[PDB]
Design a protein around this motif. Structure first.
Motif, PDB file in Angstrom:
ATOM      1  N   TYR A 159      11.980  -9.917 -54.632  1.00 26.68           N
ATOM      2  CA  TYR A 159      12.133  -8.498 -54.969  1.00 26.68           C
ATOM      3  C   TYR A 159      11.556  -7.611 -53.867  1.00 26.68           C
ATOM      4  O   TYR A 159      10.687  -8.043 -53.101  1.00 26.68           O
ATOM      5  N   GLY A 160      12.047  -6.368 -53.800  1.00 28.53           N
ATOM      6  CA  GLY A 160      11.580  -5.420 -52.800  1.00 28.53           C
ATOM      7  C   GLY A 160      11.720  -3.980 -53.255  1.00 28.53           C
ATOM      8  O   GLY A 160      11.721  -3.700 -54.458  1.00 28.53           O
ATOM      9  N   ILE A 161      11.836  -3.070 -52.284  1.00 29.94           N
ATOM     10  CA  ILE A 161      11.977  -1.637 -52.566  1.00 29.94           C
ATOM     11  C   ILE A 161      13.199  -1.076 -51.831  1.00 29.94           C
ATOM     12  O   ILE A 161      13.538  -1.531 -50.734  1.00 29.94           O
ATOM     13  N   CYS A 162      13.847  -0.083 -52.454  1.00 34.30           N
ATOM     14  CA  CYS A 162      15.024   0.577 -51.882  1.00 34.30           C
ATOM     15  C   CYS A 162      14.589   1.691 -50.918  1.00 34.30           C
ATOM     16  O   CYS A 162      14.082   2.735 -51.349  1.00 34.30           O
ATOM     17  N   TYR A 163      14.776   1.452 -49.613  1.00 33.10           N
ATOM     18  CA  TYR A 163      14.387   2.423 -48.584  1.00 33.10           C
ATOM     19  C   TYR A 163      15.601   3.126 -47.978  1.00 33.10           C
ATOM     20  O   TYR A 163      16.724   2.621 -48.051  1.00 33.10           O
ATOM     21  N   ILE A 164      15.351   4.300 -47.376  1.00 32.06           N
ATOM     22  CA  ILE A 164      16.400   5.101 -46.737  1.00 32.06           C
ATOM     23  C   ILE A 164      16.499   4.767 -45.239  1.00 32.06           C
ATOM     24  O   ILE A 164      15.514   4.877 -44.502  1.00 32.06           O
TER      25      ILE A 164
END
Length: 33
Positions: free
Chosen positions: A27-32
């Motif tokens: 799992y991770g994080i949604c970055y721009i």
């Protein structure tokens, strides 16, 4: 599906908007980008 600054998976729970999942292992994080 998640958004900007949310937890995302690379198996069955990817990011909905034009964002990337980092690190995404598992799992991770949604970055721009």
């Amino acid at each position: 599906c998640p958004g900007e600054g949310e937890e995302c998976d690379v198996e069955f729970n990817p990011c909905c908007p034009p964002l990337t999942c980092i690190p995404g292992d598992p799992y991770g994080i949604c970055y721009i980008i």
